[PDB]
Design a protein around this nucleic acid. Sequence first.
DNA 1: ACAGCGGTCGCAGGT
DNA 2: TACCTGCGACCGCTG
Length: 508
Amino acid sequence: DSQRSTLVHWFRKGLRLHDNPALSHIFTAANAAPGRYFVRPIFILDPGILDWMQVGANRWRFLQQTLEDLDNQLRKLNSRLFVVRGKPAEVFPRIFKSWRVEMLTFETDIEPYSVTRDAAVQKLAKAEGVRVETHCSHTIYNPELVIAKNLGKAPITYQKFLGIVEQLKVPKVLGVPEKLKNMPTPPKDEVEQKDSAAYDCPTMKQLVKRPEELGPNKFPGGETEALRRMEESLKDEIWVARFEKPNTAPNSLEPSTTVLSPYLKFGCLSARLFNQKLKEIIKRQPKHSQPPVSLIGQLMWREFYYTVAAAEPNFDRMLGNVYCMQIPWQEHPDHLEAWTHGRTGYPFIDAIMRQLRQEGWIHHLARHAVACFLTRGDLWISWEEGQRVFEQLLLDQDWALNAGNWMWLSASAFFHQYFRVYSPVAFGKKTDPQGHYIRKYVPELSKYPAGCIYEPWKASLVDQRAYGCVLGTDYPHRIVKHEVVHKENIKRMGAAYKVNREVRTGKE
DNA sequence: ACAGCGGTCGCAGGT
DNA sequence: TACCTGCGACCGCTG
Ligand SMILES: Cc1cc2nc3c(=O)[nH]c(=O)nc-3n(C[C@H](O)[C@H](O)[C@H](O)COP(=O)(O)OP(=O)(O)OC[C@H]3O[C@@H](n4cnc5c(N)ncnc54)[C@H](O)[C@@H]3O)c2cc1C
């Protein structure tokens, strides 16, 4: 066994055992030749990034929990997880040599950083004689294949995208890999010999530098929770079958949607498995919704954005971004700060920004409200600033999804009906007329009657005192006047669209 | 050509 | 309940 070669699976996304072709392939190969190989399933953790402010504490905790679950599940297959601290550039040269790696597998990703990181790894592997097998299992459809089927271009409308993907085959969804047979623990490398726990899963203390930023642990990380949560969602087949996104509440105290996004983002849940389960249900339920508003339709939106994103490295910026309207957003530092911390003076907006910071998830339409307010609706601040804040706070932060939906909300791409503007006062009332959600997340306003809790500036000073919260003292004065600025911004939007039109027809 | 259709998720005021 | 209309006058696709 001093002569064994090592098979490595590199986890980045795809933090699950189920439906993981890259992982299954390694386990299958090991069991094929019994005394031949050692198996190392690894996650590479750069210990310097633990302070990167672009990752908030709630998301670190989710990753910590996820790695622990992944180690637990691997232990059942007579394996374990190896969390190797460092950067791939230095880690791979060392372990290819140390472990005598024969093969390396991972799930592909389309993000710019990942494309260049993986090309580097492929380059090293090729030069060092390591075979590399990659798999597209993060999405149901391979963006490269969609773009190729569409003659070299990513489809820019959803219905056209659907028309392409129904021409594509959907791969088989796999189970969990097989238990390893006759597999002693690998020999310690030089790092392990110095410290036996060198590759153990990180503790909370090691991942979470700022525990004071942690909120209630409403969505625990890992594949186990992912499947449990999915199964609980799929249980009411009528709800599943009749689901229409636009009719779900943004302010219900309990989520009106699945809340599978963080699990889909990390790959704790396979999108292909979830797609498969939904199809089985739709087949059973004669009365059901269809894309774009159906539950399957939502998975297809995820697929849609991954595809437009895969063709555009600047997807997360305005400048140099092929899809994006060039719009003269403004710098408004004080306003940005107030929006970021849920101190705009609009209680609905503030409640949402507060839930997001505290819990790491807010409903899609709650994201609409704050994203509209920040950009074209009210503050006239760049969607890129909003994206930055969401990136920090969201458990489900997803490069492609965040960028795509921020462009949609700001009417920069995909959505163009800018005359439709969410009211920070009116929008939430439809689903929460008593303002329970505001009372919860903005407790200072909790005694305000429903008749002015969405618009506290309507309360006289004697009323404010009776409610125990005086504006400008206990809660902020509204930063801008929606009824004025949104009308001026609609005009700004039309003006920018016109400039973009000229430029287009001008390139001809 | 260039107008007409459809477009995941607007508001306010109708009935 | 769950539509309907005016507001002003978007885009991408289609033929
Ligand atoms: C400004 C803005 C920023 C966003 N940033 C992210 C993000 O960083 N990461 C992320 O996962 N979602 C993002 N979303 C999309 C959407 O709001 C979330 O995916 C959804 O709220 C997740 O909740 P759920 O799992 O209950 O969704 P469900 O309605 O139960 O849908 C199931 C799954 O379908 C996918 N899905 C649903 N809606 C969308 C959508 N609009 N776009 C793409 N996929 C979707 C998600 O994977 C979701 O988990 C953003 C939306 C907006 C408006």
